[PDB]
Amino acid sequence: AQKPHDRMAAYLESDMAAVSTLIRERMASKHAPRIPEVTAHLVRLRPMLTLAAAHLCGYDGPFHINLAATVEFIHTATLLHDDVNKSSVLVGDYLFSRSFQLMVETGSLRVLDILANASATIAEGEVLQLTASQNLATTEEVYLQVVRGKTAALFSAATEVGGVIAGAPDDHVAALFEYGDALGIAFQIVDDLLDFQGKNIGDDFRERKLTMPLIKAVAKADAEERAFWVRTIEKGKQEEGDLQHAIALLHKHAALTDTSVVARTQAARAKAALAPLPAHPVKDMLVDLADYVVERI
């Protein structure tokens, strides 16, 4: 999957350069000089999705660059905010404001709607996460909502705005959205998976954050096992030996193999969502990307 991944990068090489130029130039604040030391310090596939999607639909113009920059600004600002100290909040807010300026300059209300609704979903997931983390009532169906918010919504928006700015027909656009949604879900399930499969390991477990493997394990917990889950997640109390026991319970209940399967299934869904589109070298790159996202499992 290496040479296939490199081809996408090399094709988008120039646009990625010209984006990362914008990110650089807009992180520069007219008045305050106390920003660029933090922004440069913090500065990818999300902005790549937007450019790829634009080229796939034959876009000549300049605004795909704006939109891909917006996409990264939004991802970064969201990261800062999760790392919560005062310096983060306000710097993220700054990037949000800058992201908003960039989309407005494109002249497209449609993409603004798309990114406005996406930002709603993202922020809505972040809060849903607060509640659903450390809460053994959480179904998988509820975790998928969390995943969309925290992860997939931006993927799907990134790809969708790339098609919209290109002026693509509504079927091509829905397919771009579905590609990005499924790819984002796969992307995040892979992360979930690798937090167990071979510093990193058990992180979600200590964090008391309900990953899919944990949901699938808890879903089969007898009284004995429930007490263990009730204790290390909802009470937060953990000791020596507790990570090894959690992992044993995952394996006992096929929680990892089964999560691997959902990952692979969403990744196949991504590729299928490209089907109706007419053939195109970027179409191929996006297929390879769907495989690349799940290669590590």
173 binds Cl ion (CB under 5 A): no
Rounded distance between C-alpha atoms, residue 136 and residue 210, angstroms: 8
Of 42, 45, 1, the closest CA to residue 23 belongs to 42
Residue 41's binding partner out of a copy of itself, Cl ion, none, with CB under 5 to 8 Å set by partner kind:
none
Name the residue nearer to Cl ion (CB basis): 88 or 197. 197
Name the residue nearer to Cl ion (CB basis): 21 or 257. 257
Rounded distance between C-alpha atoms, residue 68 and residue 72, angstroms: 7
Q: Give the shortest CB-91-to-a copy of itself separation in angstroms.
A: 7
- Where would I find the beta strands (DSSP E) of 48-204? none
135 binds a copy of itself (CB under 8 A): no
Q: Give the shortest CB-36-to-a copy of itself separation in angstroms.
A: 11
96 binds a copy of itself (CB under 8 A): yes
Burial class of residue 124 in the structure, from the number of CB atoms within 10 Å of its CB (0-12 exposed, 13-18 middle, 19+ buried): middle
Name the residue nearer to Cl ion (CB basis): 90 or 219. 219
123 binds a copy of itself (CB under 8 A): yes
Q: Are residues 34 and 42 in contact, defined by beta-carbon separation less than 8 angstroms? A: no
Rounded distance between C-alpha atoms, residue 187 and residue 54, angstroms: 21
Cα→Cα distances 191→50, 60, 202, 294, Å: 22, 35, 12, 10
Residue 256's binding partner out of Cl ion, a copy of itself, none, with CB under 5 to 8 Å set by partner kind:
Cl ion
Residue located via tokens 């970027």: 282
257 binds Cl ion (CB under 5 A): yes
CA pseudo-torsion sign 226, 232, 233, 236:
positive
Name the residue nearer to a copy of itself (CB basis): 236 or 276. 236
Name the residue nearer to Cl ion (CB basis): 117 or 257. 257
86 binds a copy of itself (CB under 8 A): yes
Per-residue x/- track, 65-84, a copy of itself (CB under 8 A): ----------------x--x
116 binds a copy of itself (CB under 8 A): yes
Q: Which of 142, 254, 268, 287 forms a contact with Cl ion (CB under 5 A)?
A: 254
Q: Are residues 276 and 50 in contact, defined by beta-carbon separation less than 8 angstroms? A: no
DSSP code string of 34-49:
SSHHHHHHH--HHHHH
Please give the residue ranges that form the binding site for a copy of itself (CB under 8 A).
Answer: 29-35, 81, 84-87, 89-91, 93-94, 96-98, 100-101, 104, 107, 109, 112-113, 116-117, 119-120, 122-124, 126-128, 130-131, 145
